[PDB]
Structure 1
Amino acid sequence: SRRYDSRTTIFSPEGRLYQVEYAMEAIGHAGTCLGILANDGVLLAAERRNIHKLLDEVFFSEKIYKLNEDMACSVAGITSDANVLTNELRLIAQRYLLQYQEPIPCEQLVTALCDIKQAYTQFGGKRPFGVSLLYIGWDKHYGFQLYQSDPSGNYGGWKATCIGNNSAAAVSMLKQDYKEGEMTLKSALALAIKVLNKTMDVSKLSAEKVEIATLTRENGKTVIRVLKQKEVEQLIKKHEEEEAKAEREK
């Protein structure tokens, strides 16, 4: 019946879509997800949340998912919506591989999910998918690429971006310290740790609290390795060493 109905897709008198804006707020509450692009490789690092001692941690990184051999994504937002979208992304990549026997390029995957996300806003009187995800991938057509998809269905190709709780602060640090045309994944990894230390209120950036995954092309194979906690620990110490060196300068 009309009385028990939520408009969901109806336009505001202002002209904005109210539900989509509300969904964006949910992404803001979710944990920090940050991506930095370097010429050698593209990396996605996200902050683990609700790290209670009893959790098994057997999911091989809850935030990070591998959509295809050459593509990966991390999502901030309602977990249930994320699981539905991550499965859909994997199917779209596979369906392309069968129709044309070549891996999906990247923007095509982002646009295809984005088309679904917009469709929910467009019609059906149904709740929008309140999830925002960053896509890191390599393609023959345009090399390493990074993309961000909003709940609205609009997408972007940012070389460096953050979609988590402290996104405004992370982007400001990224804009100032990202060196365009300078690669070195190691420099990008250090920048990521510094952004994470600012974004995370908890000090010391504990290795368990953060997850880091790096996509690099080796021997023409594209390897989405996930950094081990020991690798994360050495990186945090390196950030501390730089902070200590600044203290020595002071």
Structure 2
Amino acid sequence: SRRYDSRTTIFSPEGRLYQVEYAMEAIGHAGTCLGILANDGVLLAAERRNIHKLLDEVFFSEKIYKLNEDMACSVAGITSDANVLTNELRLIAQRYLLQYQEPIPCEQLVTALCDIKQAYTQFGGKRPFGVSLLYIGWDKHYGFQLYQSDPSGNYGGWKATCIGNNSAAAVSMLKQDYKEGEMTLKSALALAIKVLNKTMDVSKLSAEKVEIATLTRENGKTVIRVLKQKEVEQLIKKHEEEEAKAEREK
């Protein structure tokens, strides 16, 4: 018994949790997923690894989970763990709603899940959840919001970020192009298309390969929509027709 125990909730000599880091490595080999904040909304854009000629497509999405009428999330890592965590997030949101009769602030939801993940890192002897998450939402306290959480139960708020394969490059590119206080949903969409176009291994980029969702505020209600393939192709074509435009100048 002491022999077979892999000891998953234990410090390493350098003062770190090996399983958490290895989980981060698992995340690194997952579909690229990024999120960008704006002044009139916030968006998620993710690489689709479920891209085969014989897939049936019965769901609204693949990596975009609706959590709440004012909140949505995207994921990267092991998908089943993502199903678990997303279900739990929904549960938490509904508990808050039952208790206070008003929507849960996004930060509170993220923290609530992150404490569970942390708990998994500290005791139990179980493997952690090989999953990182991006949260987009709106609330009456901080308006439009983008968050990110790691399997360590560690989270942070961002104006723009990426997660998954080639995340670092995407982050650098975002650091270049971003526009604090001067961001719009259109511009942010362009930026997403750009970074996704460079980071994705498979070039050219078909709508069959990307998945975009926006969260915006219309008439007192919160609207979350997944972009149809047509709009996506419009965005890509726009990107190429702008890229072939700046290359003329030489």
Normalising by structure 2, report the TM-score.
Answer: 0.99
Change (3 A) 1:50 1:62: closer
How far is the alpha carbon of 1:93 from its aligned partner?
0.2
How far is the alpha carbon of 1:246 from its aligned partner?
1.3
How far is the alpha carbon of 1:57 from its aligned partner?
1.6
Q: Deviations over 1:121-179 (max 9, x none)?
A: 01011110110000000000010010000110110001100001010110000000001
Q: How far apart, CA to CA, are the structure 2 residues paired with 1:249 and 1:61? A: 39
Supply the RMSD in Å over aligned alpha carbons.
0.7
Give secondary structure in 2 for the equivalent of 1:235. helix
Q: How far apart, CA to CA, are the structure 2 residues paired with 1:128 and 1:184? A: 37
Q: How many pairs align? A: 250
Identity of aligned residues (%): 100
Q: Deviations over 1:177-220 (max 9, x none)?
A: 00111021000000000000011011111011000000000001
Q: How far apart, CA to CA, are the structure 2 residues paired with 1:166 and 1:182? A: 26
How far is the alpha carbon of 1:43 from its aligned partner?
0.3
Determine if contact 1:76/1:133 at 8 Å carries over to the other structure: yes
After the TM superposition, list the runs of 4 or more consecutive aligned residues in structure 1 that deviate by more than 2 angstroms: none
Q: How far apart, CA to CA, are the structure 2 residues paired with 1:49 and 1:246? A: 31
Give secondary structure in 1 for the equivalent of 2:246. helix
Give secondary structure in 1 for the equivalent of 2:221. coil
Q: How far apart, CA to CA, are the structure 2 residues paired with 1:180 and 1:141? A: 20
Q: Deviations over 1:91-111 (max 9, x none)?
A: 000000000000001000000
How far is the alpha carbon of 1:228 from its aligned partner?
0.4
Q: How far apart, CA to CA, are the structure 2 residues paired with 1:106 and 1:241? A: 37
Gaps of 5+ in 2: none
Q: How far apart, CA to CA, are the structure 2 residues paired with 1:225 and 1:192? A: 16
Gaps of 5+ in 1: none
Q: Deviations over 1:67-106 (max 9, x none)?
A: 0000000000001100000000000000000000000010
Give secondary structure in 1 for the equivalent of 2:45. strand
Give secondary structure in 2 for the equivalent of 1:234. helix
Q: How far apart, CA to CA, are the structure 2 residues paired with 1:92 and 1:220? A: 24
Give secondary structure in 2 for the equivalent of 1:14. coil
